[model samples]
Target: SWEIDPKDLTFLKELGTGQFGVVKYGKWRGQYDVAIKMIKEGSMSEDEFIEEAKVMMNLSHEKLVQLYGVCTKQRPIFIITEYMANGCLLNYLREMRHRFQTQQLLEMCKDVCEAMEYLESKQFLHRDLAARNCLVNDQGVVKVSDFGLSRYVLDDEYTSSVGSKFPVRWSPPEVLMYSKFSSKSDIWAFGVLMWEIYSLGKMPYERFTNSETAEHIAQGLRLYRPHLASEKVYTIMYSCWHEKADERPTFKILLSNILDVMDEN
Candidate 1:
């Protein structure tokens, strides 16, 4: 049995709130810091909740958020994880929009690619990989977070019990058509994240909503990067959004490419 009580967590501040859950800044044992996520009761059944917990528990990587523990006795299930002091990538970029340089962007991309590679090694697809899902610490290290939408790739065909929709601009064309998703789809998402990082956290489609953006992507609309993006980064983005999923490189290959780019810096 777990030793600490969920009620004992001292809430310091609200981190963020979204449809899936609400995160709060919390502390335990006087000095230990944590991020506590509270999900509405009955959002997921006991079995599903246990399975989700297991998935997080099994993930062991420095670039991935570590799940400290969970509590299920109350109206809302509580999940505690290592606190990220610098907050999400989106917020961080917004705060320092004018300060990022090419080398800094490349470093951030390298860190994220490393994290993605680790997830792929475990056969996990981070269905919601995006700027918001990446947490950066004060030391500039990036950790991929928000695993509620994450799923293990079981077979070529992925059947969803519930229809889940991802950000249109970030989702690959195949995923827009509701085709079975794979690691390649995640690569497409990563490309969008790269754009966000370079653009100082601008939403890929700040002007379009779900349906409009979906329609655009389904119609083969490609993201147009500003002229400021380097040729190398553009090439990587193009590779990620290739029409055929098989044409895209594996996460391992992508990681190597990222490292090569980082070496240039």
Candidate 2:
């Protein structure tokens, strides 16, 4: 229902390359600035592609990337979305860490948390929620992105089985141990993303192997508090990584909890 004609799209500079294809800065009719993911024919799985398209078409939130349409019948298929100016969240923060105020940094994480809250309300689970998966726009608003993993055939396990290698550091024990995924798992990732933002793009458990990271997580270990995060802020992060998934607060609770934490001191 949301397929676009490639003839209407004008090419701009390429953003980056991926197994999915070349994501370029393109404009629709040279007016609507958009990022076009140009995938070669047969690159996307037919059933999964339509599923992603349907889900994206139904979602309209400021904090989630707005997927406009896709090109299916064309030779070079295209997935179009609103153009994010500053690029990936981690890359942007790393490049300008010296300039971003502490409050501004927290605001970015709040943006993602709020976005996740909305996603949670809809019963959606973001299999990959990390700093690199987020995007920053011209106005500095952060939108949770890269959720459209169905664009390619290799989704980390829409959990039919353990598939794509998702980030071990950001995942919860259940996901690491059982290949399980849920909204709570997403909350755990939100916590790691919070760490990434405050730590100015530092890798969580950078020295640990993926297996070691998973084992340490299974043993009640989590990322240390970022030096920049205050006591209550760190408390908020800790709550998301509870050993039992049921013990972890949902994103709806997290959004309210974070605001209360932010008001402290």
Candidate 3:
């Protein structure tokens, strides 16, 4: 809500590194505990940071991480955010999935769906939506994050001509074929995320290269159903991989379907 001064913040330790910046566990204003994404001095311009801040500033929800403030007055910009003690969902799942019940996993999926549903309603396209990009607080409430690549849509889609690298295994054919982006394309990425969740964070098609995987996807060869997934859950995940974006379910529909699966579980 206000500008933050890096001078008043105390960095506890490095949590990890990101392509654009370093994420750290820290204390902000000597009161609230926070995660700080310290931007590389010249990686992103000040206007770019402000643009990202504006996107997160208005988004408030239990299933979305809260953006506290930002400081771009000096080198290595600061983005203060609500800290999630359990850390990223991918690592959390890989480490603790053995202890998770089916309903628990379903609820996590629902949490992400509900949040993404909200984003869809607001016309936001999360260019990247994966387990690694989602965070879980101490309570295990999964919230979507890493919105640096997200955008608000004009006609429910945003096509970019920029040469941005995307995750191959998580991308759909249309996204790879043309630079066309929409919520439908995000559904494709969500399907890969579901596979990641079900497989306990195993790499999707690690045996194939990106180009080969694209061909495999084009041939309608989806990832094998996870041994632990129920038929209904797998069905929903499978539907998301449809070649035609219009064929995939909206996040709202996805929310309802996952709710049904959780109820059955």
Candidate 4:
């Protein structure tokens, strides 16, 4: 049911690229403006992305990018989804750093939390949660994108030799040590992403290698508070990085805590 006729699609300029594809800004059926991620030849295991897309198609949330349809009959398979005009959150945060107030940043954080909370409630885990994988729409609303893709595609050279590649800096001790992925692992990355948001997109553990960062995290090192983050906000972020997965707060709890912080000042 998530299939689209390639004949009805018109490809436009490129928005970005992923491991297996080029993300183009395109028009669907002469009307809908969409982000079309067309996979390159020999890049992906088609069955993997195809099935993964099928699962993701059912997910709908105000803070999650909607997967409209897919063009799989063609040579370069297209994964069409909602178009966000403001683009990727990592780039957006850096470009608009000087213009954003603390409240605005917290609101952006809330948007991501709201989406993750929905995913958690539905028993869906975002295996690759990071600032780079989020997007902002024309209305300045931040939404989670590329959810569950990591389960299908390996990427970026970190631990890729072992089969799945994930961003090391955003990973938690449990994930780094045993490849354990759960909603709590997502919670850990949320903490790092919160640090990224507050630091205006600075890379977490910038000076360390993936292996060294793993070692540091094994020893309990975590990101320090950002200049823009208040003590209460940092405390919320810290709670997500608890060494034990069971100790990390749930998205529901995190959302409520964040709202309480927003209520003050």
Top model number, lDDT: 4
| Alpha carbon lDDT at 208, candidate 1 | 82
Candidate 2, residues 196-219, lDDT tens digits: the string is 998999999998877788888889
- Winner on TM-score between 2 and 3 is 2
Best-matching candidate per TM-score = 4
Question: Model-by-model lDDT, in order?
Answer: 0.76, 0.82, 0.80, 0.87
Q: What TM-score number comes out for model 2?
A: 0.92
Per-residue lDDT over 8-126 for candidate 1, one digit per residue giving the tens place of the 0 to 100 score = 79989998875446889989766888988787553445456566567666777888877777777775767778898999899999998888777888788888888889888888877
lDDT of 4 by residue, 94-208 (tens): 9988999999999999999999999999889888788999999998999999887666563446445233355888888878778888999999999999999999999999978
Give each prediction's root-mean-square deviation over alpha carbons: 4.3, 2.4, 4.2, 1.8
Q: Which segments of model 3 are wrong by more than 4 Å?
A: 150-165
Error of 4 at 134 (Å): 0.6
Deviation of model 4 at 230, angstroms: 0.6
Question: What clash pairs does model 4 have?
Answer: none
How well does model 1 score by local distance difference test? 0.76
For model 3, give the 10-residue run with minimal summed lDDT. 153-162
Write the residue-wise lDDT of candidate 3 on 78-111 in tens digits. 7788899989999999999689887787788888
Return the TM-score for candidate 1, rounded to 2 decimals.
0.86
